[PDB]
Amino acid sequence: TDDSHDWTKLRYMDSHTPADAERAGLLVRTSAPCTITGTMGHFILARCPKGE
Amino acid sequence: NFNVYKATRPYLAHCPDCGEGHSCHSPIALERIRNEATDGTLKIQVSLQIGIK
Amino acid sequence: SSSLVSESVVSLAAGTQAVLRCQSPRMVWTQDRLHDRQRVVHWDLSGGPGSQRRRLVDMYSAGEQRVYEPRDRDRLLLSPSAFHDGNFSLLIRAVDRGDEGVYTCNLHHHYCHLDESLAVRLEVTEDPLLSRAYWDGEKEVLVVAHGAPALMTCINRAHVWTDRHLEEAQQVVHWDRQLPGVSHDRADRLLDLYASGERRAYGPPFLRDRVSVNTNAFARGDFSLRIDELERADEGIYSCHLHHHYCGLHERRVFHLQVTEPAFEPPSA
Amino acid sequence: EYKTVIPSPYVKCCGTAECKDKSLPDYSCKVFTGVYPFMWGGAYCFCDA
Numbered sequence: 001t002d003d004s005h006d007w008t009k010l011r012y013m014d015s016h017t018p019a020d021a022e023r024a025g026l027l028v029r030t031s032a033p034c035t036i037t038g039t040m041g042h043f044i045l046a047r048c049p050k051g052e
Numbered sequence: 053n054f055n056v057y058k059a060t061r062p063y064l065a066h067c068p069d070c071g072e073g074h075s076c077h078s079p080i081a082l083e084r085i086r087n088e089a090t091d092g093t094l095k096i097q098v099s100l101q102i103g104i105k
Numbered sequence: 106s107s108s109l110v111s112e113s114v115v116s117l118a119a120g121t122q123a124v125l126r127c128q129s130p131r132m133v134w135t136q137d138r139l140h141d142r143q144r145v146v147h148w149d150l151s152g153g154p155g156s157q158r159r160r161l162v163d164m165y166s167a168g169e170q171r172v173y174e175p176r177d178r179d180r181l182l183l184s185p186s187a188f189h190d191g192n193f194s195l196l197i198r199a200v201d202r203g204d205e206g207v208y209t210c211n212l213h214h215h216y217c218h219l220d221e222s223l224a225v226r227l228e229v230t231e232d233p234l235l236s237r238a239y240w241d242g243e244k245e246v247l248v249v250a251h252g253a254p255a256l257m258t259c260i261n262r263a264h265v266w267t268d269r270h271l272e273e274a275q276q277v278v279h280w281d282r283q284l285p286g287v288s289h290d291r292a293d294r295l296l297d298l299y300a301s302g303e304r305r306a307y308g309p310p311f312l313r314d315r316v317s318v319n320t321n322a323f324a325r326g327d328f329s330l331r332i333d334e335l336e337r338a339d340e341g342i343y344s345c346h347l348h349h350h351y352c353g354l355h356e357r358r359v360f361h362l363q364v365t366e367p368a369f370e371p372p373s374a
Numbered sequence: 375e376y377k378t379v380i381p382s383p384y385v386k387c388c389g390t391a392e393c394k395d396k397s398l399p400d401y402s403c404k405v406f407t408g409v410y411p412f413m414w415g416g417a418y419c420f421c422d423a
């Protein structure tokens with residue numbers, strides 16, 4: 001929130017209020033739980049098998 | 053009766069895919085499997101030494 | 106660019122194979138990304154040359170600290186995110202008589218294989234008004250009252266130690282050739298070798314067919330040039346350029362290759 | 375079902391290894407030259423080639 005560049009958290013808005021949360025809780029799935037590799041701002045990279 | 057593992061020591065083996073693509077010299081690295089059972093149960097030989105304190 | 110290391114003259118017979126020896130353990134990489142961002146810090150305590158240092162606590166990049174002594178649990182504390190800001194300082198919650206001595210904070214980069222260490226001298230007093238931190242000329246010396254915590258500062262703000270980048274593959278080795286009469290900067294490239302394995306040779310087939318480097322070049326950091334079937338047109342100033350741009354290794358070696366003679370060479374360098 | 379018994383490979387450092395003729399069923403041995411194996415902390419062998 002205070003415009004640092006820390007490597008622990010993330011921002012998410014609710015009712016035009018910017019709240020904070022943890023990188024370790026986010027996840028992406030196609031069918032299997034994917035693996036997060038590259039994490040930068042509004043961008044995420046993943047490498048995970050054939051899901052529909 | 054399980055007092056056979058006295059002077060043992062675990063490994064660091066050459067895991068081909070440690071996740072995220074590449075290889076790792078990893079301790080969880082599996083070396084050999086055997087699937088002789090007729091009902092899908094799997095007997096696995098991993099580079100850890102579990103149960104031992 | 107780079108800096109010079111060895112600027113030698115090599116005399117060999119025509120028709121033989123030239124070997125321009127170029128070796129470096131700090132340019133090693135493999136066809137894997139196997140802990141290629143692995144660093145380790147560790148705190149050791151010693152008491153001079155005639156005492157044995159003991160490992161107290163060590164730490165891998167992006168992890169949580171592991172303590173070696175059960176007494177030292179909840180007593181020696183490091184910042185678990187030391188590799189984000191380069192603040193590797195160690196807090197001792199409560200000191201005793203076994204803790205007096207010189208502490209070394211050791212930074213090690215396993216990928217570039219560089220090692221660096223710093224010392225701090227601990228003296229434990231009884232009066233708190235004598236407690237100070239001063240510079241003895243080459244290391245910080247802290248005098249701390251017994252039972253008080255001790256913050257032994259270890260701060261290294263170099264970019265190579267933090268978790269910011271470490272995109273490894275930008276090491277590159279260049280093989281250059283300077284023909285006689287040809288001025289510098291317009292030298293023809295002989296080989297470009299990327300850590301991933303890709304090679305670029307330049308020139309007509311007569312040069313490309315005869316220029317090779319051993320297939321384990323980047324794996325062992327030996328980029329020695331092998332020139333098969335030496336011709337008179339091969340003479341000149343050859344240069345091996347080893348570049349590990351992220352960890353700041355930038356070296357070149359220069360070989361003055363003259364082909365005249367098989368046996369009566371003088372040993373240079 | 376068979377079981378492929380594969381022991382640890384004999385890395386002959388700074389030397390040339392020699393195959394010993396055993397009477398095992400489907401006994402297989404092969405000596406590969408110019409190997410330079412790497413471990414966690416670098417080369418297992420002191421010699422280069």
Ligand SMILES: *[C@@H]1O[C@H](CO)[C@@H](O)[C@H](O)[C@H]1NC(C)=O
Pocket residue numbers: 184190192194196256
């Ligand atoms: C480094 O860590 C110590 C330990 O508490 C802390 O007091 C200090 O403020 C830190 N400095 C920086 C620049 O993070």
